[PDB]
């Protein structure tokens, strides 16, 4: 059962790939298609073919952007980090979720190059941008659903029924698992990260700019390991900042308080693995952390505290200074016993370590009544 | 709607201990993380500690990590910066503050929301 590897992920992706002068979709060739537009260096746009009535999604990214992104990308073996999108993350973890995992990312469909190997395509792209020409790299996936901002939105003109909330927050729960056992993070869950259907609350993940691999034979990024292990990430800016997780901002804090202005710079030349530890985090776990604001926003509608750095946020230092636990936390007394013991298992750092998504998903809260 | 008032320092020898005190007068104490940064003529400034609101957490530079630590007493409106095991390279104008906060993005900086006059160390070879 093949996991998210980056050789396998760049394979996904060339199967994928082509001029998009070459691509029609039904009958209707690309270039006659009327895309409606959806800070950002990426456009999003949304489309309508007429063959089979079907709805597309498009992300169109600068070539300037993707050969300078390829390039970093292949030299850490698909470990770059960057506080912004990864371009040339997102298009693999995209090809390969769709290849070998159907039903977490909406279908894709083509990445397609708009005026052999990944090499092949920079080397083009490279002497395109060298004559000035232009272009975007066009990422199109099936158009699904709404996000789950949206879904709220449309359906409460009370807050949505505690009964709907649930069935949320577990297929997202679900999505987490399934995503986490194909090899690959996310790292920016929100509600307009999550899309639903119409047809029984089925869900979906967006996005995969944040995303890193979940696995590595790689220590830190330096030297070569004998196995695999859980990857750790230096970059602590990831997703929205009141989704950020608190050991990232103690990260963040390391790098302020002794001047470092360039992450990717100041380590780039250092071997000492002891140093190395104090920049690095674990990714599942803050996954995992997510995901418990995530349950928070929805069971609470709307945020508790704004920031999880105790130092910027009184709110957040109550929460630790009861043992990040949701029962004997005065906002969250008054709530279910055993839906507080589930969150309390997706953000305290003892249970990220310890506790399983499969094991979370059968929790004893998810057949309660009401 | 806070003022602060540094004292406590002096010169000392090498390896000598000082206690920097910080008086805040003005609105509730709990109501505001503090902290200490320093300014040596020479360069630019360093910051030096952290406190969160009601103290449970604190961080520090890697320059005094574990030689100075920062507490406060908020019965008494009072932080401090106990600082041990001093050496020449510690000899600046310190500044008690109020309200730090920052961006998680690393090009960012550290900005105080309050800062008193400040307090000399200076520290013998």
């Known amino acids: 059962s093949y996991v998210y590897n980056w050789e396998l992920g760049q394979k996904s992706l060339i199967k994928m790939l082509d001029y998009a002068d070459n691509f029609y979709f039904n009958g209707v060739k690309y270039s006659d298609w009327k895309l409606t537009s959806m800070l950002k260096d990426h456009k999003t746009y949304k489309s309508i073919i007429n063959s089979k009535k079907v709805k597309l999604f498009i992300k169109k990214i600068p070539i300037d952007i993707w050969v300078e992104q390829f390039n970093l990308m292949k030299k850490y073996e698909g470990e770059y980090l960057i506080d912004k999108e990864n371009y040339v993350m997102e298009a693999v973890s995209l090809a390969f979720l769709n290849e070998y995992y159907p039903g977490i990312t909406p279908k894709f469909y083509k990445i397609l190059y708009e005026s052999q190997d990944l090499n092949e395509l920079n080397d083009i792209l490279t002497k395109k941008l060298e004559n000035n020409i232009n272009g975007n790299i066009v990422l199109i996936s099936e158009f699904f659903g709404e996000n789950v901002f949206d879904y709220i939105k449309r359906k409460k003109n009370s807050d949505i029924s505690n009964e709907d909330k649930k069935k949320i927050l577990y297929n997202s729960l679900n999505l987490l698992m399934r995503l986490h056992n194909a090899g690959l993070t996310h790292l920016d869950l929100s509600p307009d990260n999550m899309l639903i259907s119409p047809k029984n609350y089925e869900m979906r993940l967006c996005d995969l700019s944040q995303s890193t691999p979940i696995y590595t034979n790689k220590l830190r990024h330096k030297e070569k390991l004998n196995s695999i292990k859980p990857f750790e990430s230096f970059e602590p800016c990831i997703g929205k900042i009141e989704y950020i997780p608190p050991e990232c901002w103690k990260i963040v804090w390391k790098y302020k308080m002794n001047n470092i202005k360039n992450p990717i710079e100041y380590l780039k030349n250092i071997s000492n693995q002891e140093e190395r530890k104090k920049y690095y985090y674990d990714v599942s776990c803050a996954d995992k952390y997510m995901l418990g604001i995530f349950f928070i926003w929805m069971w609470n509608n709307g945020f508790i505290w704004k920031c999880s750095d105790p130092i910027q946020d009184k709110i957040f230092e109550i929460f630790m200074k009861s043992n990040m636990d949701l029962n004997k936390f005065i906002m969250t007394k008054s709530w279910p016993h055993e839906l507080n013991n589930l969150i309390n298992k997706l953000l305290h750092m003892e249970h990220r370590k310890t506790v399983k998504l499969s094991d979370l998903s059968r929790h004893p809260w998810w057949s309660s009544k009401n | 709607q806070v003022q602060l008032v540094e004292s406590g320092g002096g010169s000392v020898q090498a390896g000598g201990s000082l206690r920097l005190s910080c008086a805040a007068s003005?609105?509730?104490?709990?109501?505001?993380?503090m902290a200490w940064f320093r300014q040596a003529p020479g360069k630019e400034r360093e910051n030096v500690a952290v406190?969160?609101?009601?103290?449970?957490?604190?961080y520090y530079a890697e320059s005094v990590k574990g030689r100075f630590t920062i507490s406060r007493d908020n019965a008494k409106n009072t932080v401090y910066l106990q600082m041990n095991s001093l050496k020449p390279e510690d000899t600046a104008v310190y500044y008690c503050?109020?309200?730090?906060?920052?961006?998680?993005?690393?090009?960012?900086?550290?900005?105080?929301?309050?800062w008193g006059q400040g307090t000399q160390v200076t520290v013998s070879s």
């Open positions: 503050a109020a309200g730090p906060r920052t961006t998680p993005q690393a090009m960012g900086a550290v900005e105080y929301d309050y």
């Open positions: 003005g609105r509730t104490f709990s109501s505001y993380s």
């Open positions: 406190i969160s609101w009601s103290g449970s957490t604190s």
